[PDB]
Amino acid sequence: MYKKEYVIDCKGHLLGRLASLIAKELLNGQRIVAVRCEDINISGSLYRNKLKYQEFLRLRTNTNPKKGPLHLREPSKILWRCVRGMLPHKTYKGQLALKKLKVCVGMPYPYDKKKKYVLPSALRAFRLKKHRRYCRLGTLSSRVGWNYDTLVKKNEVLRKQVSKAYYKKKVNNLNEKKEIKTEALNLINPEQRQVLENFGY
Amino acid sequence: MKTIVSTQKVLIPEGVKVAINARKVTVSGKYGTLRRSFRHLPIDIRLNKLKKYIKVVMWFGVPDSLACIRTVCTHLKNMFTGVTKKFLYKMRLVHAHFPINSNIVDNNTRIEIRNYLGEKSVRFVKALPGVVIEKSPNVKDEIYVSGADIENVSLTAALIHQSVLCRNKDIRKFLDGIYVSEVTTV
Amino acid sequence: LQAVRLYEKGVILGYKRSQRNQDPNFTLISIKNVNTKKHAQFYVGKRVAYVYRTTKHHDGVKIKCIWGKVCRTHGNSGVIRAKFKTHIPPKAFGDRVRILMYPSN
Amino acid sequence: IDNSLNTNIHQYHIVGRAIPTAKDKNPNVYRMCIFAKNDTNAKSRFWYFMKKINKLKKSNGELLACEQIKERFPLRVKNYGVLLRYDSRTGTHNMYKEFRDTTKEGAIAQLYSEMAGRHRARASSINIIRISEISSSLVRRPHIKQLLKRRLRFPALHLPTLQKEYRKKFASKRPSTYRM
Amino acid sequence: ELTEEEKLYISKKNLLFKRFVEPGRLCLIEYGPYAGKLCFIVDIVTITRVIVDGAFITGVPRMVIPLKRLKLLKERIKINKNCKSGFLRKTVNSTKVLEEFNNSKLGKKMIIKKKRDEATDFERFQVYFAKRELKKKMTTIKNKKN
RNA sequence: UUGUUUUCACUUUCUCCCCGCACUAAUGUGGGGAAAACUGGCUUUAUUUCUUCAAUUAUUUUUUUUGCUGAGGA
RNA sequence: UUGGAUAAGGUGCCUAAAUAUUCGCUCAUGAGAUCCCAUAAAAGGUGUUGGUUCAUAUGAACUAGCCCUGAAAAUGGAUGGCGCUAAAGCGGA
Ligand SMILES: [Mg+2]
Ligand SMILES: [Mg+2]
Ligand SMILES: [Mg+2]
Ligand SMILES: [Mg+2]
Ligand SMILES: [Mg+2]
Ligand SMILES: [Mg+2]
Ligand SMILES: [Mg+2]
Ligand SMILES: [Mg+2]
């Protein structure tokens, strides 16, 4: 929490545990950018979560539904609203904190070339026994009328190809640098070579 | 309670090629290739190529989990049977007053049904991938559905039987329909 | 290159409180690399500086400080309670402070 | 040495009798062995059982010894068989159970946890009869037979348990549960 | 007997689960007061409890430990039925296993980190000076290559 | 109702033999039978910085780093 | 008024303090979440976990923990909210 901005990819995290760890970072003061929100997991069967969303959809202001609960079915807005329900968003400071979060589906330009981190205390692999049931947020949002699941995958394929080429070039550069390093050790005063040898550099 | 180890052994026949990597299985043989995955249940299976006998082993387990070992073993045995001897399902179409008119099109898929209880309409089913439909060479009212995969052929045979279910009459008296009569191999 | 650091970084959290009560005599501070109670006790006597900016000049300059001290830990995770000469304004709860190292041992 | 792994159960040896009177001046002497948290609780249970089984109330008795029996081979592994009696919501029952441990009270601690977990039985409704050591050829339960084969081996399949300091909340590569 | 064919064949089946629990496993300790030390399994009590003993070489006594506080390592010593501390010390001394762990990928990094943590001010500056010297040779060989 | 007194079980080994001849989850295994005292246990020394000398209680003596306060004026 | 240390209750976020440790149980196509306190029964289950008897290692009977059926109302709604299943649920340490 001592950085200008952190970037988190949410592929493989459970919704509640991730949303709880983001809210305290926001309250303490930290910008957060969350990407790949369509790959978030929840800890029930897909049908059991579709029923819960159907319960959410049928509560509305009787006299005028323009007001009242607004049902947002993109995956990124779902996490946005789940975090909003863990902040004191009706004061001033708690509204300031809510504005320091940005959410995306996919991985647009500025962040496709930045470093992404993960939160191990929210990863499904470490938190859910292997004989339990779970669903994916993209499938659920499609089942309630989102309509953009396919295009995101189509774009992710291209992004991954470009990243693969970049990684190839990076590995070549690293090997070329390792050779230059190993040559230059022979051309230094011996005592500097011992002091580098002793401390494992 | 928990049990430390439990194992079962399944032999490989003579004319079969096998491969297992991450609980993903492929088998090959005279009549084609079959693919199947098992990445939803905790097992580490061991394949001995020089000998036969894939082996399935499970560490600490409970009665509800231990019941899935024999299931996997039987699925493996069935797909071994599939590639050396295709599965066969025989079906008899039985009528009382109106004879049933069958018709196979499209390279031995897509059976067509006419005159079921004399109704002037046409009913279709279309076989699952890998399954071929044909009528018997010996007897009048037999259809053969067959080939290489027990699940696909048995479910095609089931799709045919439920094609001609009888509506709101007494079904202990109106017995017309198409029924599975024998299960064997080719 | 220039302007050496010679201090450890920190963020000022709220006051010492419960649910629904305030007690603004002490303030809670978080230290950058400290996340156990045993390690937080290492800093238990150091001097704290909170430096901020204004818009007018006050004595020829546009910067002023409020001095404080590290008094104790706050329980199991490396947070501390600090006592300042004047109470910290609540419009500062995400800002920076300098955990100095002057009173050396 | 590690106070996060200790249980608070010890064993005691208590001896008692009644105050001698003009009608009775060589009264019987009684002994018991009790598992408790401290010696005061053990004396409490001793007088409870004296009153219930014999006609001895504390206020006209007298205590003679409290000794706290210790364990002779605290690092060898034994097999233990326990006899119980506990009250359910709709009756009173009695059972036999078996444990594996290195100390008798190390097994009594397990027994209390198992009886809370499996049956929701509180410590106040449980009476313990006859802890004893049993040989390995007279074991009756299937989950003890598992552990006494010729050559015991198995892989370790737990998730890691790290120190609080290296439990960094915001990581740079997603870890693995395999660990071979 | 078994021919060479079967023989190497036994030595070619890389099993999924290596590193079993048994008398002689190494088990760097990960949680608790004795965290960051080495030890040995000498007996197993239940599924979850294990008796552990690092001989008088390491600073751990013979004691009981929950199994979830351990990390099994590659090295195992073939020790006997119900060994005690005295014979275990002799066996670990004669087999020379501790210092062949120190040559692995993880022992080297543990030792190097400990070395770095004990450095003084002058030693830190010496490391900085050596790196600054090395950078010049880097950047002159580079400019020669292109 | 207690103190003696007898009977038979209790140890595993990377050793040997027979049967299944590779059958195991295992760089081994299932059934049957032997050997030894390496390992484990017990005696007599003469020893404690190779190593250990613990834990709880009773009774005593110190120690590192630091927060807050300075009433009175004989 | 200034310091210190608690009670009753709490320690995933709202919200100051444990995503603490160490044992068991539970999967719910209407789970559950503790004085007062804000409802549920008789009768059933070849769900799963322990236990007690009678019968050459298979049958039968019985018993009690969590879960399920019995279980229908009027504006849109309430374990306080989010949510939570390697619990942030229930019984202990
Ligand atoms: Mg307010
Ligand atoms: Mg209020
Ligand atoms: Mg001899
Ligand atoms: Mg006060
Ligand atoms: Mg609670
Ligand atoms: Mg908090
Ligand atoms: Mg029955
Ligand atoms: Mg709570």
Side-chain angles (χ1 to χ4, degrees), chain B residues 2 4 43-44 46-48 59-60, chain E residues 6 9 13-17 20-21 47-48 67:
Chain B
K2 287 174 188 175
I4 297 276
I43 46 160
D44 53 324
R46 301 176 193 171
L47 160 72
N48 198 335
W59 304 94
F60 314 83
Chain E
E6 293 177 350
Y9 183 85
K13 46 175 201 183
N14 56 335
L15 305 174
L16 184 75
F17 291 119
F20 290 69
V21 298
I47 291 293
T48 64
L67 183 50

mmCIF file of all heavy atoms in Angstrom, chain B residues 2 4 43-44 46-51 59-60, chain E residues 6 9 13-17 20-21 47-48 67, unseen atoms left out:
data_model
loop_
_atom_site.group_PDB
_atom_site.id
_atom_site.type_symbol
_atom_site.label_atom_id
_atom_site.label_comp_id
_atom_site.label_asym_id
_atom_site.label_seq_id
_atom_site.Cartn_x
_atom_site.Cartn_y
_atom_site.Cartn_z
ATOM 1 N N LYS B 2 -10.960 -42.455 7.237
ATOM 2 C CA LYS B 2 -10.190 -42.370 6.007
ATOM 3 C C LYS B 2 -9.378 -43.643 5.833
ATOM 4 O O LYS B 2 -8.957 -44.260 6.814
ATOM 5 C CB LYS B 2 -9.265 -41.151 6.012
ATOM 6 C CG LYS B 2 -9.995 -39.840 5.844
ATOM 7 C CD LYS B 2 -9.069 -38.657 5.998
ATOM 8 C CE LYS B 2 -9.863 -37.367 6.022
ATOM 9 N NZ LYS B 2 -9.006 -36.184 6.281
ATOM 10 N N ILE B 4 -5.980 -45.434 3.889
ATOM 11 C CA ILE B 4 -4.672 -44.986 3.419
ATOM 12 C C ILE B 4 -4.546 -45.173 1.910
ATOM 13 O O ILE B 4 -4.316 -44.211 1.171
ATOM 14 C CB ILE B 4 -3.546 -45.709 4.175
ATOM 15 C CG1 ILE B 4 -3.601 -45.363 5.664
ATOM 16 C CG2 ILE B 4 -2.199 -45.330 3.597
ATOM 17 C CD1 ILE B 4 -2.918 -44.079 6.022
ATOM 18 N N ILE B 43 -7.426 -38.776 -8.383
ATOM 19 C CA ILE B 43 -6.790 -40.053 -8.674
ATOM 20 C C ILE B 43 -5.445 -39.773 -9.316
ATOM 21 O O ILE B 43 -5.258 -38.750 -9.976
ATOM 22 C CB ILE B 43 -7.657 -40.918 -9.615
ATOM 23 C CG1 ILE B 43 -8.171 -40.061 -10.767
ATOM 24 C CG2 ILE B 43 -8.800 -41.568 -8.869
ATOM 25 C CD1 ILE B 43 -8.607 -40.851 -11.968
ATOM 26 N N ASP B 44 -4.503 -40.692 -9.131
ATOM 27 C CA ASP B 44 -3.266 -40.694 -9.905
ATOM 28 C C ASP B 44 -3.122 -42.071 -10.531
ATOM 29 O O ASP B 44 -2.790 -43.037 -9.846
ATOM 30 C CB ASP B 44 -2.052 -40.344 -9.044
ATOM 31 C CG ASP B 44 -1.940 -41.208 -7.819
ATOM 32 O OD1 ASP B 44 -2.992 -41.551 -7.253
ATOM 33 O OD2 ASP B 44 -0.805 -41.533 -7.424
ATOM 34 N N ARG B 46 -1.695 -44.990 -13.145
ATOM 35 C CA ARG B 46 -0.377 -45.398 -13.606
ATOM 36 C C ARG B 46 -0.518 -46.368 -14.766
ATOM 37 O O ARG B 46 -1.260 -47.350 -14.675
ATOM 38 C CB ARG B 46 0.414 -46.021 -12.461
ATOM 39 C CG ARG B 46 0.570 -45.056 -11.313
ATOM 40 C CD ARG B 46 1.266 -45.657 -10.137
ATOM 41 N NE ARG B 46 1.122 -44.796 -8.974
ATOM 42 C CZ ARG B 46 1.480 -45.143 -7.748
ATOM 43 N NH1 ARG B 46 2.010 -46.332 -7.534
ATOM 44 N NH2 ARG B 46 1.311 -44.302 -6.741
ATOM 45 N N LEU B 47 0.196 -46.090 -15.850
ATOM 46 C CA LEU B 47 0.104 -46.853 -17.085
ATOM 47 C C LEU B 47 1.427 -47.565 -17.329
ATOM 48 O O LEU B 47 2.483 -46.927 -17.361
ATOM 49 C CB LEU B 47 -0.240 -45.936 -18.256
ATOM 50 C CG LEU B 47 0.086 -46.445 -19.656
ATOM 51 C CD1 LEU B 47 -0.866 -47.549 -20.051
ATOM 52 C CD2 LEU B 47 0.020 -45.308 -20.651
ATOM 53 N N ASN B 48 1.365 -48.882 -17.496
ATOM 54 C CA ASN B 48 2.528 -49.704 -17.805
ATOM 55 C C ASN B 48 2.430 -50.108 -19.269
ATOM 56 O O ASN B 48 1.598 -50.942 -19.629
ATOM 57 C CB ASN B 48 2.585 -50.928 -16.895
ATOM 58 C CG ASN B 48 3.949 -51.574 -16.870
ATOM 59 O OD1 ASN B 48 4.730 -51.438 -17.807
ATOM 60 N ND2 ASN B 48 4.240 -52.293 -15.799
ATOM 61 N N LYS B 49 3.263 -49.504 -20.112
ATOM 62 C CA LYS B 49 3.194 -49.793 -21.539
ATOM 63 C C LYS B 49 3.791 -51.154 -21.870
ATOM 64 O O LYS B 49 3.220 -51.897 -22.674
ATOM 65 C CB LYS B 49 3.900 -48.695 -22.332
ATOM 66 N N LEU B 50 4.934 -51.492 -21.265
ATOM 67 C CA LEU B 50 5.599 -52.755 -21.574
ATOM 68 C C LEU B 50 4.686 -53.935 -21.284
ATOM 69 O O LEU B 50 4.525 -54.833 -22.117
ATOM 70 C CB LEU B 50 6.899 -52.875 -20.777
ATOM 71 N N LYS B 51 4.086 -53.952 -20.105
ATOM 72 C CA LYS B 51 3.026 -54.891 -19.789
ATOM 73 C C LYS B 51 1.682 -54.268 -20.173
ATOM 74 O O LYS B 51 1.611 -53.290 -20.919
ATOM 75 C CB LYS B 51 3.091 -55.280 -18.315
ATOM 76 N N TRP B 59 -5.221 -42.132 -2.633
ATOM 77 C CA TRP B 59 -4.804 -41.921 -1.255
ATOM 78 C C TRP B 59 -6.024 -41.446 -0.471
ATOM 79 O O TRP B 59 -7.144 -41.476 -0.984
ATOM 80 C CB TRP B 59 -3.620 -40.967 -1.210
ATOM 81 C CG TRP B 59 -2.493 -41.455 -2.058
ATOM 82 C CD1 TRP B 59 -2.237 -41.116 -3.350
ATOM 83 C CD2 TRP B 59 -1.485 -42.401 -1.687
ATOM 84 N NE1 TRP B 59 -1.126 -41.779 -3.803
ATOM 85 C CE2 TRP B 59 -0.645 -42.573 -2.799
ATOM 86 C CE3 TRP B 59 -1.206 -43.111 -0.518
ATOM 87 C CZ2 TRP B 59 0.452 -43.427 -2.778
ATOM 88 C CZ3 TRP B 59 -0.114 -43.947 -0.499
ATOM 89 C CH2 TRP B 59 0.696 -44.105 -1.620
ATOM 90 N N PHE B 60 -5.819 -40.956 0.752
ATOM 91 C CA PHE B 60 -6.837 -40.913 1.802
ATOM 92 C C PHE B 60 -8.228 -40.635 1.256
ATOM 93 O O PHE B 60 -8.477 -39.582 0.662
ATOM 94 C CB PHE B 60 -6.470 -39.839 2.830
ATOM 95 C CG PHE B 60 -5.035 -39.872 3.262
ATOM 96 C CD1 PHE B 60 -4.055 -39.261 2.507
ATOM 97 C CD2 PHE B 60 -4.668 -40.514 4.424
ATOM 98 C CE1 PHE B 60 -2.745 -39.297 2.902
ATOM 99 C CE2 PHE B 60 -3.358 -40.555 4.821
ATOM 100 C CZ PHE B 60 -2.397 -39.944 4.060
ATOM 101 N N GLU E 6 13.827 -54.858 -17.491
ATOM 102 C CA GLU E 6 12.983 -54.514 -16.359
ATOM 103 C C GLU E 6 13.687 -53.520 -15.451
ATOM 104 O O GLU E 6 13.053 -52.643 -14.868
ATOM 105 C CB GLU E 6 12.634 -55.772 -15.574
ATOM 106 C CG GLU E 6 11.742 -56.737 -16.335
ATOM 107 C CD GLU E 6 11.468 -58.010 -15.562
ATOM 108 O OE1 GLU E 6 12.119 -58.225 -14.518
ATOM 109 O OE2 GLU E 6 10.601 -58.795 -15.995
ATOM 110 N N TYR E 9 13.777 -49.967 -16.487
ATOM 111 C CA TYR E 9 12.350 -49.677 -16.526
ATOM 112 C C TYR E 9 11.815 -49.315 -15.149
ATOM 113 O O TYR E 9 10.937 -48.455 -15.035
ATOM 114 C CB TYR E 9 11.574 -50.863 -17.091
ATOM 115 C CG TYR E 9 10.101 -50.568 -17.204
ATOM 116 C CD1 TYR E 9 9.592 -49.918 -18.317
ATOM 117 C CD2 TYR E 9 9.222 -50.914 -16.188
ATOM 118 C CE1 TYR E 9 8.250 -49.634 -18.421
ATOM 119 C CE2 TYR E 9 7.879 -50.626 -16.280
ATOM 120 C CZ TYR E 9 7.398 -49.988 -17.401
ATOM 121 O OH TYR E 9 6.054 -49.703 -17.500
ATOM 122 N N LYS E 13 10.083 -44.756 -14.392
ATOM 123 C CA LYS E 13 8.708 -44.386 -14.064
ATOM 124 C C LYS E 13 8.737 -43.283 -13.016
ATOM 125 O O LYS E 13 8.735 -43.536 -11.812
ATOM 126 C CB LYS E 13 7.923 -45.603 -13.588
ATOM 127 C CG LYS E 13 8.638 -46.479 -12.579
ATOM 128 C CD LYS E 13 7.720 -47.579 -12.079
ATOM 129 C CE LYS E 13 8.180 -48.139 -10.754
ATOM 130 N NZ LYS E 13 7.319 -49.262 -10.309
ATOM 131 N N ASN E 14 8.762 -42.035 -13.475
ATOM 132 C CA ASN E 14 8.729 -40.914 -12.543
ATOM 133 C C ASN E 14 7.322 -40.789 -11.976
ATOM 134 O O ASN E 14 6.398 -40.348 -12.663
ATOM 135 C CB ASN E 14 9.184 -39.626 -13.224
ATOM 136 C CG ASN E 14 8.374 -39.293 -14.446
ATOM 137 O OD1 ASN E 14 7.788 -40.170 -15.075
ATOM 138 N ND2 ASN E 14 8.334 -38.017 -14.796
ATOM 139 N N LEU E 15 7.153 -41.204 -10.728
ATOM 140 C CA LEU E 15 5.842 -41.192 -10.113
ATOM 141 C C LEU E 15 5.416 -39.764 -9.788
ATOM 142 O O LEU E 15 6.239 -38.860 -9.643
ATOM 143 C CB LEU E 15 5.844 -42.047 -8.852
ATOM 144 C CG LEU E 15 6.325 -43.478 -9.079
ATOM 145 C CD1 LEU E 15 6.439 -44.207 -7.764
ATOM 146 C CD2 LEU E 15 5.392 -44.212 -10.011
ATOM 147 N N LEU E 16 4.102 -39.568 -9.693
ATOM 148 C CA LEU E 16 3.578 -38.251 -9.351
ATOM 149 C C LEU E 16 3.992 -37.851 -7.942
ATOM 150 O O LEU E 16 4.494 -36.745 -7.719
ATOM 151 C CB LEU E 16 2.055 -38.243 -9.487
ATOM 152 C CG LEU E 16 1.344 -36.910 -9.252
ATOM 153 C CD1 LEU E 16 1.531 -35.982 -10.435
ATOM 154 C CD2 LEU E 16 -0.123 -37.138 -8.979
ATOM 155 N N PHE E 17 3.806 -38.746 -6.981
ATOM 156 C CA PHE E 17 4.100 -38.466 -5.583
ATOM 157 C C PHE E 17 5.413 -39.136 -5.209
ATOM 158 O O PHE E 17 5.476 -40.358 -5.061
ATOM 159 C CB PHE E 17 2.975 -38.950 -4.674
ATOM 160 C CG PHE E 17 1.713 -38.163 -4.804
ATOM 161 C CD1 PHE E 17 0.547 -38.770 -5.216
ATOM 162 C CD2 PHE E 17 1.690 -36.816 -4.502
ATOM 163 C CE1 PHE E 17 -0.615 -38.051 -5.332
ATOM 164 C CE2 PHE E 17 0.535 -36.093 -4.621
ATOM 165 C CZ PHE E 17 -0.622 -36.710 -5.032
ATOM 166 N N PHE E 20 7.763 -39.413 0.432
ATOM 167 C CA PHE E 20 6.827 -39.991 1.382
ATOM 168 C C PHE E 20 7.262 -39.696 2.815
ATOM 169 O O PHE E 20 8.401 -39.308 3.073
ATOM 170 C CB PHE E 20 6.714 -41.497 1.175
ATOM 171 C CG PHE E 20 6.008 -41.882 -0.083
ATOM 172 C CD1 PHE E 20 6.589 -41.660 -1.314
ATOM 173 C CD2 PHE E 20 4.763 -42.467 -0.035
ATOM 174 C CE1 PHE E 20 5.939 -42.010 -2.466
ATOM 175 C CE2 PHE E 20 4.112 -42.824 -1.188
ATOM 176 C CZ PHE E 20 4.700 -42.594 -2.404
ATOM 177 N N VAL E 21 6.338 -39.877 3.755
ATOM 178 C CA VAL E 21 6.655 -39.729 5.171
ATOM 179 C C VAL E 21 7.035 -41.096 5.721
ATOM 180 O O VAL E 21 6.336 -42.090 5.490
ATOM 181 C CB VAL E 21 5.483 -39.112 5.955
ATOM 182 C CG1 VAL E 21 5.171 -37.725 5.435
ATOM 183 C CG2 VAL E 21 4.262 -39.986 5.918
ATOM 184 N N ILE E 47 -2.724 -39.940 11.807
ATOM 185 C CA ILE E 47 -2.664 -39.353 10.473
ATOM 186 C C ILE E 47 -2.053 -37.959 10.529
ATOM 187 O O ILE E 47 -1.294 -37.561 9.639
ATOM 188 C CB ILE E 47 -4.066 -39.332 9.841
ATOM 189 C CG1 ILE E 47 -4.529 -40.748 9.517
ATOM 190 C CG2 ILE E 47 -4.074 -38.492 8.582
ATOM 191 C CD1 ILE E 47 -3.723 -41.397 8.438
ATOM 192 N N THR E 48 -2.358 -37.200 11.584
ATOM 193 C CA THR E 48 -1.976 -35.799 11.662
ATOM 194 C C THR E 48 -0.824 -35.499 12.610
ATOM 195 O O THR E 48 -0.258 -34.406 12.528
ATOM 196 C CB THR E 48 -3.184 -34.943 12.073
ATOM 197 O OG1 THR E 48 -3.601 -35.297 13.394
ATOM 198 C CG2 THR E 48 -4.337 -35.164 11.124
ATOM 199 N N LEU E 67 1.606 -32.460 11.768
ATOM 200 C CA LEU E 67 2.239 -32.715 10.479
ATOM 201 C C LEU E 67 2.113 -31.531 9.532
ATOM 202 O O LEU E 67 2.964 -31.352 8.655
ATOM 203 C CB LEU E 67 1.638 -33.966 9.844
ATOM 204 C CG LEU E 67 2.232 -34.430 8.517
ATOM 205 C CD1 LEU E 67 3.736 -34.498 8.607
ATOM 206 C CD2 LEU E 67 1.662 -35.774 8.128
#
